[PDB]
Design a protein around this ligand. Sequence first.
Ligand code: BO2
Ligand code: BO2
Ligand code: BO2
Ligand code: BO2
Ligand code: BO2
Ligand code: BO2
Ligand code: BO2
Ligand code: BO2
Ligand code: BO2
Ligand code: CL
Ligand code: CL
Ligand code: CL
Ligand code: CL
Ligand code: CL
Ligand code: CL
Ligand code: CL
Ligand code: CL
Lengths: 183, 183, 182, 181, 180, 181, 185, 178, 179
Amino acid sequence: PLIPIVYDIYSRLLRERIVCVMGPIDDSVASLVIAQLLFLQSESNKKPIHMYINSPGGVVTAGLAIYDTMQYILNPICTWCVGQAASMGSLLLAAGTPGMRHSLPNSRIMIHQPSGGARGQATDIEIQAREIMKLKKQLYNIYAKHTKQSLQVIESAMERDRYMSPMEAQEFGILDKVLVHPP
Amino acid sequence: LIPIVVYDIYSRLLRERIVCVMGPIDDSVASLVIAQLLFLQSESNKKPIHMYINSPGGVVTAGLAIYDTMQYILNPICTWCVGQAASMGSLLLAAGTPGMRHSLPNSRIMIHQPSGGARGQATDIEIQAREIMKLKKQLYNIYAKHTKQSLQVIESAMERDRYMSPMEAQEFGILDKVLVHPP
Amino acid sequence: LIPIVYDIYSRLLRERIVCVMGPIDDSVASLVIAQLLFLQSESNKKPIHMYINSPGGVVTAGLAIYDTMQYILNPICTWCVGQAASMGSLLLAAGTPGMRHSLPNSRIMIHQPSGGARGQATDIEIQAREIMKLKKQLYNIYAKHTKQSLQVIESAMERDRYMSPMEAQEFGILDKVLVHPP
Amino acid sequence: IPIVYDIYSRLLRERIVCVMGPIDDSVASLVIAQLLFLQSESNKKPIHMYINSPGGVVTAGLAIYDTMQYILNPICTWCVGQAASMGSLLLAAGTPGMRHSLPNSRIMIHQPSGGARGQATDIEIQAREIMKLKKQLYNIYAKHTKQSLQVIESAMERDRYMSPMEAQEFGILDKVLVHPP
Amino acid sequence: PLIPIYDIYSRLLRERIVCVMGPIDDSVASLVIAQLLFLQSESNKKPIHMYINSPGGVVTAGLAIYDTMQYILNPICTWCVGQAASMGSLLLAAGTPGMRHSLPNSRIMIHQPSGGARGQATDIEIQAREIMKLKKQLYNIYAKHTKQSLQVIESAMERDRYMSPMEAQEFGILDKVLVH
Amino acid sequence: IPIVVYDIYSRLLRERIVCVMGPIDDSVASLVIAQLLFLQSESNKKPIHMYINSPGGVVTAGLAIYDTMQYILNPICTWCVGQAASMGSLLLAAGTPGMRHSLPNSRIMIHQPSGGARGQATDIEIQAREIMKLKKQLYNIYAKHTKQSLQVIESAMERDRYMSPMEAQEFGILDKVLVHP
Amino acid sequence: LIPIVVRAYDIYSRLLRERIVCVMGPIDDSVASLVIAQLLFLQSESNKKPIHMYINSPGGVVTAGLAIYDTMQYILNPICTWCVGQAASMGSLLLAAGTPGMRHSLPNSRIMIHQPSGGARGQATDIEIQAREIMKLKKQLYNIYAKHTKQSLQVIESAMERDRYMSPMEAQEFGILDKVLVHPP
Amino acid sequence: IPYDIYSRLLRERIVCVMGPIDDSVASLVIAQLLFLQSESNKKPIHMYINSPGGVVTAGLAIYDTMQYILNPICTWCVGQAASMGSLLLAAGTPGMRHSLPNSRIMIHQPSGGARGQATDIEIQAREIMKLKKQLYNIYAKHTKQSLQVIESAMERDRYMSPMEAQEFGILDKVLVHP
Amino acid sequence: LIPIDIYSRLLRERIVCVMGPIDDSVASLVIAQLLFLQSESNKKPIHMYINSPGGVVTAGLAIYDTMQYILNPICTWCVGQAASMGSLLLAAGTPGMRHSLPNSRIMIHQPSGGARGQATDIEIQAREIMKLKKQLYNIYAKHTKQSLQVIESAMERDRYMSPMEAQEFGILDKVLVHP
Ligand SMILES: CC(C)C[C@H](NC(=O)[C@H](Cc1ccccc1)NC(=O)c1cnccn1)B(O)O
Ligand SMILES: CC(C)C[C@H](NC(=O)[C@H](Cc1ccccc1)NC(=O)c1cnccn1)B(O)O
Ligand SMILES: CC(C)C[C@H](NC(=O)[C@H](Cc1ccccc1)NC(=O)c1cnccn1)B(O)O
Ligand SMILES: CC(C)C[C@H](NC(=O)[C@H](Cc1ccccc1)NC(=O)c1cnccn1)B(O)O
Ligand SMILES: CC(C)C[C@H](NC(=O)[C@H](Cc1ccccc1)NC(=O)c1cnccn1)B(O)O
Ligand SMILES: CC(C)C[C@H](NC(=O)[C@H](Cc1ccccc1)NC(=O)c1cnccn1)B(O)O
Ligand SMILES: CC(C)C[C@H](NC(=O)[C@H](Cc1ccccc1)NC(=O)c1cnccn1)B(O)O
Ligand SMILES: CC(C)C[C@H](NC(=O)[C@H](Cc1ccccc1)NC(=O)c1cnccn1)B(O)O
Ligand SMILES: CC(C)C[C@H](NC(=O)[C@H](Cc1ccccc1)NC(=O)c1cnccn1)B(O)O
Ligand SMILES: [Cl-]
Ligand SMILES: [Cl-]
Ligand SMILES: [Cl-]
Ligand SMILES: [Cl-]
Ligand SMILES: [Cl-]
Ligand SMILES: [Cl-]
Ligand SMILES: [Cl-]
Ligand SMILES: [Cl-]
């Protein structure tokens, strides 16, 4: 129910170098996750950081803030897909350190192109549409960077909502290990 | 309510070959106006039709439906700006037969680029944005056709909201005569 | 429910009486203008009686009625009944000179135009200039029919100026304050 | 509604049917009732159908379409303003050679949209039916535009906007006339 | 685009045509039954045309229309236009045998009755029992006019079942699928 | 409402047919009683047909129709079409004996009156005592026309009782369950 | 509010010290996070001591309940599931996910199993994608139930097509739980 | 709230079950009962009940927790104990169910709702009937009454004074002063 | 959660505040404070300050039974107002220890409620609200030393009383200004 006291249960996991990225991802969640990552880098810039992801997606800018912080900090980051990693969650899941992107057997991974809105005069419509297209190409480049897939494959896969099992997402290159029990 | 005679007041004006295009222009207003223009052409394809305009604007497709009907019917059309002819209302005012576009002294004319919205995936956003840009060039061409203005001048004038007196609109080419009393 | 004599307003329209009562929007402007054109078609010489009981309304809608009044050849006897505020007082003073009447207990209010604007700073300035253009335009119309200088029109309409029928006759808004028929 | 009866009843005397605004079961009822009434008056005289619709219900539009094809009268469709979604289907459903459009109209074609809710079995049934309508509407478009099913699927997969000339090239309409010839 | 002029449906009623389009409730049932009775009093032998474009509606109102169809002596030609779902499909199959028609691009949907119940457990059992009676009642009506087994009706109407005009003709809902 | 050449219900009122369909309130009671008085003035001997498709309604409104039914001298043929629940079943049984019919697939529901009470404890007693009077009063009316004992009425109408047309014929609510005349 | 036991903490913290995780109420991404966080905390304290999981849930999101499921299967600690009040929808799957022989239920609890429900909206291509994903989850949850109930996939499909309600003894015969206990044995 | 007072009473082995009963209230009560058992599985647990009722599944969760823990449970009806509250009042240890003089006890059959297709409607109705028999058997167990009298009493809303409930078997002692 | 709480400081001085509308939540807090004050000392008096316009009948009877159960003499003080159930708890104080400030007001009236459902249900609820009417009338008659007729006539409608009027009626004992 309430945040359990051991401090809150998440503060105890932060001591174990575990960051939870669960639920929709907005600027608020982006601020908390970037703050925990920076604190964990200041504690030790070599120890790994475990990032547990159970997110249905969220704002593009907020997730890209989390993504760049993950690539900036020197600590290896072990991403763990738990439950689901959809939309921005799947980008963060694939953004883990090579070889350390894991997923539980019954998770699901979803990738798709950005969605958004535009309103105003025709000039403002074109500026907003030009920007959301830049985001579409930008995220396609990020996915192709980490999945090591060709941009053609990324374009064809993320044009509509694409659902993947943990084995399928490993075959696509989004994750590296589908483990039931710990080896 | 609609006053009666010995029909409604607008029906009596429809007998006088007068069509009232007042208020915002949607598909319902376009239906009634086009129906009156077709009725008035069947009665006489030579007698002029007086179209009184007091509109702040409305749907682009509905206003373009009225515009094409005006250009299709063989009857000369005397457009009269009463009160205001803004947005699509100003296009219908300029769509009148040359030399037959009138305006009362204290009316105002407003011209501006089309506005709208777009929501969905990035591919859809581009589709709506490209379509609203097509309408922007299309409406600029219609204004440049009847105002005898260069397409650049139309772009520069309708980028923001541009308000004009009846004389400023006559100099612009939207209307032909500004009359206080009938000559 | 409109009493069926048709409706009582139609019976008065046959008597060349147009009622401009209530707030003035594009809808009221359409009906009033339509009634004025019908009455001009029936006779471009017979006078038209315009009864005004308005608290005001949209500027463009009232200016449509004003221009239609000035365009048609028929003399227009404007009667202020109840109140004539904002655009109502303008239509009251817009009647044919010497035919702008008022009842003894009516009131007349004149004030500067009001409105709003929203958007970017460029849009805000465009709307602000336009509402100032309307302000000068309406002030000139008042100065035209009240026979007043622009100085007096600006000073009076800066705030809400309420006038008795005598005060509006002195100011030039109306011409006759009658209790009983002439 | 002006009185002449209503202005639409006067155009119905001239054998004109207005299909403007969104298309639902109510609009389909009025349109079908006028078409049947116009066929009873004369099964040989043509019927002019003016369209200014952004689309509407699939079932209601297919009711109008089947009534158009059933009646023996030739039907001249006129795209005024816009004919989007079901409206463009009715525009193409006109008699071959009698599908017209005003110069500044626009025509939009897209695949059907809908929703589904319930158990996983219910979701599957609604999805199969939404796919049957997708293939059914694609076959109707390919029939009247004389286009291959390949081109219909590729065009109607996303929202496709066409000028009156582009729709004349695609086979949606036959003539784009400014002034009457 | 607004009740064309009397109303176009009154002109069709002179031609013995009754329109049953839209959802079906006590109001639609009242109008349809009134038109059918008027058409019987005018001529109790002339056929009555019943155009159906309904997504369904209230069971009681639809059974009111069904019983009036069976009671009046006039043959009834049911025409599936656009769609005939839920109760609309029952009225379509309620027509005089051999006079149930459908346009080429119509669709026919059959499913078991849906509803709600609220109150004490004793009450809950009462409405649920009444709901089941309607389920068996409608299953028997469908089997009567479709010439199908009660097993076929239960299997088909257990979930929402969507049919083309040819499929509904094979199932027995309608008789003729017009085409051009 | 379709128009003959007036509304379809007025044409049925010429045929001495009164429609009691939908919920029953003071407005529906006012129209039904006004038609019954008009039909008695036309002829106090010709029968009056009353078609009932009601889920019930206000108690006082339904008892107003009931008392009007009992007052006029015209034999009343009540017909249960679709359903006749709550007050609808009472007016169905209120028909002239031997002339209360029901179509084969209709349903008839009987239950005790429902209501609400709010205020001070004294006001709660006044309102609760009144609704008990309505329960005995309606039970006595049902026992009068159904030829059933008051015990059977109390046992049946304590909860919602649903009856087929044949079940209601045996209970005494209606007289004939006809399919084709 | 949450009672305090005296440091200081809530009553659920005291039960967490006793290695008791409460999964009560609807199961969403927020509940899944707290449950998974407590399970990992309990595993770091001792990867051999058993973890007691009390379940009183009417169900919830599929992805969240599967997040709890996979975490239970991942951690090495034996997990004793206890069905208290009700274990419906995803709650019943979490009841059967306990360590074999350690799935308990109180006498008056009830267990409910059914197929996943959802919704879909958009273009026909979108609708077809959502419907397929909803069917994948249906076969996936059927496979999980068949795994832990030791039932054939045929029985699972036939049972979970509609809402199936069970007594604690009925779920023990089906294989959802292991022992129905009144008082402590 | 003035730690909190309910924590002070929990130290005195007092669990307050007041207000409507849902899954949240059931979780807190069960958590307090388990903590009190871990402190001492022999000392009694006082359960003060002032509830107009609530969810069946939640109240059954509290009841089974009361029957599972070894501690004798002293139930006290204060203000009122209606619907599920009366069951938890009767769920007390035999001879340890008390009630204040001006308390109120109400018993009635379960209420609920159902919606969906006819097949679903039946499934819900059959389940709400199972809960009806289940709660009837639980009431018949602690009140030492036949199942037939339980159906008849709980068919409609039945209100009882503290002495009437003691007669029915819901509680044991009606005290004014200790 | 305002001053550093002031009510905990008053509870140390054996003061229980019963102010605002009375529901099951206010009853739970008041009863818990009374039980805590009895555990500290079953002889020292408990001061109960009442500023309530009334509330739920069952909640007010819970507080009343808790007042009568505990052995501590309870000093009830009518501050501001003591209406509906607030007047019952004011009269529920230990005889001779029911006080009131000079400018307070005390209101007594019959119970109010509502009922909805079938006629059978409507009667069951109406029968119960009548039981509560007699029950509260007997409680008021017990502590005010008044006859049942005086209770019925006074509480049939809303009856407002000054502290002196409530002292003569038997609701309180002392009307003090400056102590
Ligand atoms: C495709 C991946 C990168 C992101 C997906 N989400 C988005 O694209 C989100 C979904 C959204 C957010 C706010 C309002 C409406 C919709 N789209 C955007 O963030 C966005 C941002 N700027 C312009 C237009 N859209 B998914 O839900 O994480
Ligand atoms: C600019 C002149 C030529 C015409 C103007 N019409 C419009 O702006 C209208 C009114 C409108 C409708 C929806 C949202 C925003 C605005 N815009 C459109 O019709 C429209 C059509 N397609 C895409 C986007 N906007 B005016 O009548 O406001
Ligand atoms: C000042 C006299 C001459 C006319 C007055 N009319 C107006 O003030 C009207 C009524 C109005 C409408 C919207 C918001 C506020 C007010 N104002 C306008 O018409 C208006 C027009 N353009 C820009 C801003 N306001 B009065 O209220 O009739
Ligand atoms: C694609 C063309 C042929 C027809 C289009 N019609 C529809 O999309 C319509 C309108 C609609 C309804 C809900 C959600 C979105 C849209 N869709 C349907 O009629 C419909 C019918 N059955 C199942 C699902 N959708 B158009 O008129 O928008
Ligand atoms: C299944 C076919 C034969 C008939 C279908 N009709 C119904 O299911 C209708 C639609 C409806 C009406 C009111 C409240 C809830 C639901 N269901 C009922 O009439 C109904 C009857 N009794 C109890 C509960 N619902 B269809 O027209 O949706
Ligand atoms: C029981 C049969 C005879 C009549 C039934 N009617 C009632 O129970 C109705 C339900 C109702 C309807 C509208 C507004 C308020 C209450 N009961 C009453 O009208 C009513 C009126 N006064 C006191 C008590 N009940 B049925 O239509 O539910
Ligand atoms: C059937 C058992 C296995 C699980 C059930 N869960 C669901 O039905 C849940 C309820 C839910 C949650 C969030 C949003 C929408 C719907 N369904 C889903 O999670 C879900 C997931 N993907 C597609 C469609 N529905 B139960 O907890 O109702
Ligand atoms: C009869 C006693 C045992 C319980 C009474 N309450 C119930 O039965 C409650 C009433 C209720 C009220 C609001 C929201 C949800 C449910 N019903 C249930 O718990 C319930 C449980 N399963 C199926 C159907 N209903 B009482 O009012 O607490
Ligand atoms: C008259 C004095 C003695 C008591 C007064 N209390 C009441 O009237 C209270 C107000 C109330 C509270 C909760 C829910 C409904 C109504 N009445 C009842 O508690 C109540 C209880 N059962 C049946 C009818 N009314 B007063 O407002 O405190
Ligand atoms: Cl890194
Ligand atoms: Cl003039
Ligand atoms: Cl066809
Ligand atoms: Cl044809
Ligand atoms: Cl027949
Ligand atoms: Cl009679
Ligand atoms: Cl494990
Ligand atoms: Cl025990």
